[PDB]
Design a protein around this ligand. Sequence first.
Ligand SMILES: Cc1cc2nc3c(=O)[nH]c(=O)nc-3n(C[C@H](O)[C@H](O)[C@H](O)COP(=O)(O)OP(=O)(O)OC[C@H]3O[C@@H](n4cnc5c(N)ncnc54)[C@H](O)[C@@H]3O)c2cc1C
Ligand SMILES: Cc1cc2nc3c(=O)[nH]c(=O)nc-3n(C[C@H](O)[C@H](O)[C@H](O)COP(=O)(O)OP(=O)(O)OC[C@H]3O[C@@H](n4cnc5c(N)ncnc54)[C@H](O)[C@@H]3O)c2cc1C
Ligand SMILES: Cc1cc2nc3c(=O)[nH]c(=O)nc-3n(C[C@H](O)[C@H](O)[C@H](O)COP(=O)(O)OP(=O)(O)OC[C@H]3O[C@@H](n4cnc5c(N)ncnc54)[C@H](O)[C@@H]3O)c2cc1C
Ligand SMILES: Cc1cc2nc3c(=O)[nH]c(=O)nc-3n(C[C@H](O)[C@H](O)[C@H](O)COP(=O)(O)OP(=O)(O)OC[C@H]3O[C@@H](n4cnc5c(N)ncnc54)[C@H](O)[C@@H]3O)c2cc1C
Ligand SMILES: CCCCCC[N+](=O)[O-]
Ligand SMILES: CCCCCC[N+](=O)[O-]
Ligand SMILES: CCCCCC[N+](=O)[O-]
Ligand SMILES: CCCCCC[N+](=O)[O-]
Lengths: 431, 430, 432, 431
Amino acid sequence: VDFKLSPSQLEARRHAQAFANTVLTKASAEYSTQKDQLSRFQATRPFYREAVRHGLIKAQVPIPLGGTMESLVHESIILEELFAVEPATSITIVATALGLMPVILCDSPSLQEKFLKPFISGEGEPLASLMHSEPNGTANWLQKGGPGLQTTARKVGNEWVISGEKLWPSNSGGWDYKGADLACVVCRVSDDPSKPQDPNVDPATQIAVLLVTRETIANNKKDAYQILGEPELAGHITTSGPHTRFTEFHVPHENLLCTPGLKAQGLVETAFAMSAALVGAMAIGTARAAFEEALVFAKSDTRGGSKHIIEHQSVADKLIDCKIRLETSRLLVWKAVTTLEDEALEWKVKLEMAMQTKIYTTDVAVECVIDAMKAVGMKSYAKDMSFPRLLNEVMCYPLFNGGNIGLRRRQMQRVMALEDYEPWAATYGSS
Amino acid sequence: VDFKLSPSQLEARRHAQAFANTVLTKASAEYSTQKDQLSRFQATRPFYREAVRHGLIKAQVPIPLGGTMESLVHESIILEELFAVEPATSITIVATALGLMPVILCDSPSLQEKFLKPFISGEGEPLASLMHSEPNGTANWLQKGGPGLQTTARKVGNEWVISGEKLWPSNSGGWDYKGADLACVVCRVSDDPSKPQDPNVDPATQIAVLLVTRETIANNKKDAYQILGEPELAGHITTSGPHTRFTEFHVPHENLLCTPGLKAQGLVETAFAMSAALVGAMAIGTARAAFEEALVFAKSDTRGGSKHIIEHQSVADKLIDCKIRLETSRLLVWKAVTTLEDEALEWKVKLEMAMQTKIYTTDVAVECVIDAMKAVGMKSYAKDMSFPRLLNEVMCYPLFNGGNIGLRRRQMQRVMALEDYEPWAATYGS
Amino acid sequence: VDFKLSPSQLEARRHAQAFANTVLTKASAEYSTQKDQLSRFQATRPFYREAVRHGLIKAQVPIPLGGTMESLVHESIILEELFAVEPATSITIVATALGLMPVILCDSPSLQEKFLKPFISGEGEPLASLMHSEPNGTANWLQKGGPGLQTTARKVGNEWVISGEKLWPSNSGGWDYKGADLACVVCRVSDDPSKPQDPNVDPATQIAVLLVTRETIANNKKDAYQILGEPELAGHITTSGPHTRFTEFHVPHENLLCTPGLKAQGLVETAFAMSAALVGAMAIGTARAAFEEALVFAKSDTRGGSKHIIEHQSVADKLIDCKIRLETSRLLVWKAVTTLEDEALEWKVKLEMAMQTKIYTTDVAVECVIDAMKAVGMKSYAKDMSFPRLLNEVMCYPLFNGGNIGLRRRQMQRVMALEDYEPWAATYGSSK
Amino acid sequence: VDFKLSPSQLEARRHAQAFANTVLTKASAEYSTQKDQLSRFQATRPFYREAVRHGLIKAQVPIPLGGTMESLVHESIILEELFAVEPATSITIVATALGLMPVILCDSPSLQEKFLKPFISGEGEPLASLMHSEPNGTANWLQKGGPGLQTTARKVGNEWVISGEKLWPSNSGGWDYKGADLACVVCRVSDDPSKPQDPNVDPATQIAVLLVTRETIANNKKDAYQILGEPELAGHITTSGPHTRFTEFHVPHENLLCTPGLKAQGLVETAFAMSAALVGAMAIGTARAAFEEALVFAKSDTRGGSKHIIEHQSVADKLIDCKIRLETSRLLVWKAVTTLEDEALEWKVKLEMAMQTKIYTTDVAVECVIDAMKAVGMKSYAKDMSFPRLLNEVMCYPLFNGGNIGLRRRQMQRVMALEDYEPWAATYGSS
Ligand SMILES: Cc1cc2nc3c(=O)[nH]c(=O)nc-3n(C[C@H](O)[C@H](O)[C@H](O)COP(=O)(O)OP(=O)(O)OC[C@H]3O[C@@H](n4cnc5c(N)ncnc54)[C@H](O)[C@@H]3O)c2cc1C
Ligand SMILES: Cc1cc2nc3c(=O)[nH]c(=O)nc-3n(C[C@H](O)[C@H](O)[C@H](O)COP(=O)(O)OP(=O)(O)OC[C@H]3O[C@@H](n4cnc5c(N)ncnc54)[C@H](O)[C@@H]3O)c2cc1C
Ligand SMILES: Cc1cc2nc3c(=O)[nH]c(=O)nc-3n(C[C@H](O)[C@H](O)[C@H](O)COP(=O)(O)OP(=O)(O)OC[C@H]3O[C@@H](n4cnc5c(N)ncnc54)[C@H](O)[C@@H]3O)c2cc1C
Ligand SMILES: Cc1cc2nc3c(=O)[nH]c(=O)nc-3n(C[C@H](O)[C@H](O)[C@H](O)COP(=O)(O)OP(=O)(O)OC[C@H]3O[C@@H](n4cnc5c(N)ncnc54)[C@H](O)[C@@H]3O)c2cc1C
Ligand SMILES: CCCCCC[N+](=O)[O-]
Ligand SMILES: CCCCCC[N+](=O)[O-]
Ligand SMILES: CCCCCC[N+](=O)[O-]
Ligand SMILES: CCCCCC[N+](=O)[O-]
């Protein structure tokens, strides 16, 4: 057991820090002048171009697939540094990563070569999006006897036809609402969308993922793909994750990611279990920013007293609790990603580790930001400090990438209920 | 022991609700348009105008002083209902209340008559402000051996001369940066405004409060009263609480609220204890709004499943936590204001109850909002729901009106450490 | 609205303290020497005797029914004072109160006169028990399609025959395992106990409460009522709440408390709702003792430093947190009992308030005790301070009288899910 | 970065498990009949004997010093397994380990050879004790202007004389009240113990450690070493940590561990930093036992309903919180002990990490047991389940080995306040 970083991990840290400090710090000057979410998102396009120029999108794709990702620990380090400075553009990078995951994870070299090509070129500003979430919600998307996903698909000739709505998937409409360069659209198979999901079939058997490109959208009637709105978010105010409607939207059969059913469901589950672990690094970067701002302040400011406020035990208690939350969170993320990379472990073990990580790191990042604000005091409430941004940004984490209450805890609960659940398998090995 | 509300308390609640629903809900359409904190505050002026017309400023003044305040429980009920709908203007009302308190609490009939007059007229949009807070902080303003307050006053003939800076006090600059109608400026007495506070004197013995009106400002040089900046706040984005600088600012001795010393300090302490308890009503309003929005959602939305989400035990657990926080908070605020009204209790007993109340209610209001968001899920994060606004608004409460960490817990700790501390005197008697 | 105590409420507090300080403080010297739960229980008999002689058992019974209970607030004050000193015997008094409740609450004077008689005499050491809990659990007793209570009853002739097992009900076996003076035994009506509960019938419609006394037990075959064991508890080590087996136990029809069904469930729900609120006073007593010991310690010990430890912010923060939990807890108990006493409010409003009260006060008392220990430090861990006892005692509260997780949270949840739920009805009135 | 266990790490776990299961499980039947703390401790003597025979005492001493300790990760794994089953005797082993540490850590091979000798032999039942704690408290022992330690020492001719009282240090009086085989007695140097400590002297400059064996005690008058009493503990009821008075107690100058002053305080601080980190593993073992007992119950009891209790979301949520607390704890412990072993890192980096570890692991192990009990419900309150013992055992951890409130948080606070504090040095290296 070993925690030391290799020279390439230290170089990824250095490179990510440099990118964030030299490039991302310029973003706010551009996006703050914009009056709405899409406009703010479009204001970040030049920084995502710089990201691409700096190899950061290429770094979202494994080396065997033509990318430059070295490991999930490198990835975790990169995200913590990026989110420690500015989530604008950083969010777009990870949303693209998630949207590429179902293709990265499929077992089909031919499909991969085709769809990953623009993401590993080091050119343009290509966007990917995993379109799962819906207006009616998704916590119950696999509930037997439930309505299931409201975005359905049916085969017609050599085409699939998508009917439904999505909401929240980052990058989905692209820079311009003519679509992401690659969207993985998660659908429930249904020959008659007017009829309810069959209460006697396991919903996981009915899942299909259909790949939708800008060409796909161009090849459809104007009204078949419609952006109906763009949520104005509390924080991450420069991301795009619009409300999209598909009406009789046609997709070629060659764009079906895999055979509909458990294999499709498994690809979605895997993709979101990878993101469950990595989202902890985003949570850590945000909360670390809050902790470091409070820390510097408490060591430099006496608040009209005789001593720096760090000398007050109550103030120090808050900073201590922040520090501990950040340390345990990082350790858990690194354990989780290495667990996911471990070929000798059952999926069950990986999934449970990734759920734990998502739940802990995202819940605890909120407490960390709030305790930092309490330690700094009134000054933390005004916009000449980072806290107002941080408080809004950090509250996204427990809710997003599958919220902790409806989704992650339920996924973890199912694994623990299994007769062959081995709580410590990721640590002490299996029996 | 009784929890029953009287006809006039129930009518105060109805009147507050109707005012918030018919008047306050209209404010957002006006202030949302504006580009900066000050402009948003100014867009709010017609609504404060209506608040005066509805008697809500009079209601901040006790009846023996010519106002219409009926009791602190009536007050608590009004604030809860106002903040459950819209803190814009509501905030301006409570800041005025606070700015009036040192005058209300002093026992000088001629000062009360002269300075409370606009606030009991029912006319105009008069503002008050208690100007205590400073750029450098105030948690340590009474630390023996510390620098103390950085706004100082010295007597020069029949006048006092103010040198220094205030930051945060609501309404202080008025609507137009020519000043609030009444400002109570809290100062440290210093003959030499540049020599450090004497490490050998108890800081409480050096406090003075000077009353400053738009007339006082108009009677000084332009450069003696400078507004240097206006914080852009996370929430309560329509309030004003500027950075003010006083340079050789002259105030008549007749505008000295009381004898400098323990008495001036006691007046500030008493004002901030009353606000300590009443800010709990604010936190309850904001947190209640969150809870009720989450509850209605949980009972009417299945989130793509077969049952309303209130049926999921993890969801119900959050709402149960929210409800308990609110219920215990309102009980504590009513106990505190009642304790404050009791002529039989000693000050320390009242102070300590007021401190517990500010600490508890403001800390748990935050948890209540956040748990309400977690229950609603991803939808709570977008501005078509109330929560983004509520989240920012709620975080103000543990930090403001004397932050819990630096101020209220230390006030409470001092009381607990006194030799004659009786933890249960407000309940079982002294 | 008003928080002022009356001369009678102040006297009630004075009396409870006097009894705790002069009588209950002596109990330890007697029970500490005993080897097992039952023996420890028996060693408290003389103390329960004094409590009866002080009127404390008579005080568990409403005035209209021949007792001396003045109100639920009086009761709340008394319980807090008793538990702040010694839960031995105090626990027996409240367990009796619970056992009396289904009778107190039934609408039948003739029944009440007969069964409450010994409890209001001011003599002897009569014990009551409400026997609901079972070895297999009760969180799901009203789950439709579930097994239901495993203690069943059937009418044979003009008697009822009880089959099954109870576990946990305080005082149930009496002082000598020949039975409590009054036991209210909650059963599920079944004509064939070998057949499972009908999954199509609402469990609440099958509930029956049978009154069993020492005579009822003496009139049955010796093997019809067997005590099988007595749990060794972490804290409250002087109570008795044994494991009881009923086998073809015969009870006279005149001992059926009311018509079986929703009415019988309603009496049980009402009794446990009342205790749910009053059990907060117990939690408060235990946690108050933790708090005051820590506080006096912090104000008189410098732990080798120059200043009393109360002057350290982290220590103060703990005592502040304790104080706040106790203050909010008592306010909620008084609001909840006062709510339950209000004739104008719907049951669901009273129930919901009682559930919140049980949940909040019991959870936060645990925190209060643990924080008081952290503030005092290593010294809190040794038996020359009260904390080791307070620690084990306080952990009882979130688990007992209907656990927060399986019972109280679920009862509250059901009320919140109802179409006509009014969150603030107890504070601001109904819109109905 | 790597979390894999080596074959020797796995054998250590297996061995520790076998020992706890075949040996320590039998201790209860023996100590449960005894009527006081000292007799309960004495009733565990045959079990410590087996422990020595199994090599567990030898395993407390680094190999370079003649012991078998392979690493601090091995040690953490051993302690976790032992305390998951039975803290009787396990606690004695650990107390001995702390007692040995000032010698292990000093730079005197001659002292090390002489005094470690019994502990590396594999025979008898030798006990060590680090005697720091006192009747009047120790959280303020280094406060300038404060009374300081109330156990003082002075040099008289070629001997040191000890005046004062100790309370709590485990094993301090040995099996029979004639003394531990080795006690490191921590003293404040005072020539005239009637005088107050000089408020102008830095207290750390006055610390001395005197080694005291059964020999030293035998060579002194009986009245000069008196056991005044033995605390009756809430949990860990089979340990001894008596109240002892030294009156004119004579010690040969050869038994002086090192130069009094900062060197001596340094040794005490290092020994207590190591234990701070390792006490985490004890708290994990205890909390794990609670979690596992609750899990098994939850997956096999319906509590009179139709489904196992784990299917209830509120029960699962408690179990989930327990697991995350345990998982984050072990991670922090392993990170701390490896940080402590890193020769490249400055001491304050190691100290801050050790403090983090002790505070977090001990506070959350308490929450874990109580959540476990709440999940199981009323059944958890009776002694036919483990929870009553575990609840009492777990409450020791936040209070002992330097309590979080008075000691570990202030130690961490002081480091954080340093002008050159580097929060992430143990992770991302020092600048
Ligand atoms: C910046 C941002 C980026 C995003 N990125 C993407 C993306 O790339 N792709 C994508 O598809 N989506 C994305 N989302 C959406 C995100 O993944 C959400 O987590 C997702 O919509 C699910 O939300 P939810 O967990 O609240 O579930 P919902 O289904 O909306 O349920 C909401 C709440 O209901 C309750 N609930 C419902 N069912 C249960 C149950 N069975 N048990 C207990 N409680 C229940 C819970 O309290 C839950 O929190 C993004 C959102 C944001 C804001
Ligand atoms: C909308 C709004 C309205 C307001 N209204 C008014 C008003 O009408 N009048 C007015 O005067 N002010 C007003 N304020 C300011 C408000 O009252 C603040 O609470 C006040 O400025 C004091 O801030 P503080 O508690 O953070 O103390 P600071 O002195 O700013 O201290 C900041 C932090 O330092 C730490 N600290 C400092 N000293 C200690 C110590 N001794 N012990 C432990 N920790 C310490 C604490 O963590 C504390 O939170 C308003 C602010 C806002 C945003
Ligand atoms: C089973 C067991 C084994 C033990 N092993 C040993 C051993 O081997 N060797 C040994 O020497 N001791 C041992 N101890 C004692 C243990 O290490 C205690 O932690 C130690 O006695 C110090 O206790 P304390 O942290 O509570 O400090 P104390 O000095 O007792 O202070 C108690 C409380 O006062 C408050 N306080 C005091 N000063 C401050 C401050 N300046 N700032 C904030 N708060 C303050 C804190 O709340 C603190 O918790 C053992 C005890 C037990 C029960
Ligand atoms: C001192 C003492 C006095 C007592 N007094 C009496 C008395 O006088 N009369 C009497 O009858 N009993 C009494 N009891 C028992 C007490 O009332 C218990 O609370 C009762 O046995 C119910 O226990 P439980 O809540 O743990 O439920 P259980 O049925 O034992 O359930 C245990 C756990 O399972 C889980 N669970 C089960 N079902 C669900 C569900 N549907 N949803 C979510 N979680 C679930 C919960 O985590 C719950 O805590 C006493 C016990 C003690 C120790
Ligand atoms: C790695 C995370 C992708 C951005 C957010 C995805 N999501 O919310 O599901
Ligand atoms: C009663 C509330 C007054 C408004 C805020 C005052 N303050 O923050 O100090
Ligand atoms: C009012 C208290 C009764 C004693 C305990 C009863 N119970 O746990 O159910
Ligand atoms: C690692 C040693 C723990 C046993 C005693 C700890 N202590 O309290 O100092």
